[PDB]
């Protein structure tokens, strides 16, 4: 299927990971993190809103960085739900 997933970027002692959207290059890049230091290197929301609020499927760590950076809160409207889907998670309307 489509997903939100981490690929792999970067070195050995400095990994990188870009957020991106894939089916299983890449469809879209949803942002770039760096994982040692914590911090979104890109982010690009208007990218995040609408693959998010399409019901793509994000994966455990994808979600728990765009969540943890506010990135969730500021795109996804209140009238939809995210909901744990096995391995991950969606956004579908609350009804």
Same mark, same amino acid.
């Given at each position: 299927a489509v997903r939100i997933r981490?690929?792999?970027?970067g070195r050995? $002692? $400095?990994? @990188?990971y870009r @957020?991106?959207?894939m089916d299983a290059k890449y469809i879209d890049i949803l942002?770039?993190?760096?994982?040692?230091r914590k911090v979104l290197i890109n982010v690009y929301p208007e990218k995040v809103k609408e693959w998010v609020?399409?019901?793509?499927?994000?994966? $455990?760590?994808?979600?728990? @960085?765009?969540?943890?950076?506010? @990135?969730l809160k500021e795109v996804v409207p209140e009238g939809?739900?995210?909901?744990?889907?096995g391995d991950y998670y969606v956004f579908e309307?609350?009804?």
């Open positions: 981490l690929a792999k970027f050995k $002692h $400095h990994p @990188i @957020i991106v959207v942002g770039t993190y760096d994982p040692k609020l399409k019901g793509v499927e994000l994966s $455990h760590r994808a979600k728990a @960085i765009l969540w943890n950076h506010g @990135i939809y739900e995210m909901k744990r889907v309307k609350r009804e």
